[PDB]
């Protein structure tokens, strides 16, 4: 029912601005991101070599 | 020129909000209230027992 996608990278977000805090003589900003790694769904379609 | 009521509860306010402070990753809100206790305006209409 899904696509082929032998390898998939699970990313929730790449760049989120948390907020801005303003002070008397300075200000601070925050950023964040989320990920879950890589997932292999069809191991029978992968061939790998260790030494060169 | 008054409601009588013998007893009275002096409440300045039940629930008010003071201010909101917003930070980079959270925010804080504050609340307050005021009261003055109970007042007996007609002490000639009260009878009470210590025991029981």
UniProtKB/TrEMBL annotation, chains A, B:
The protein, known as = Capsid and scaffold protein
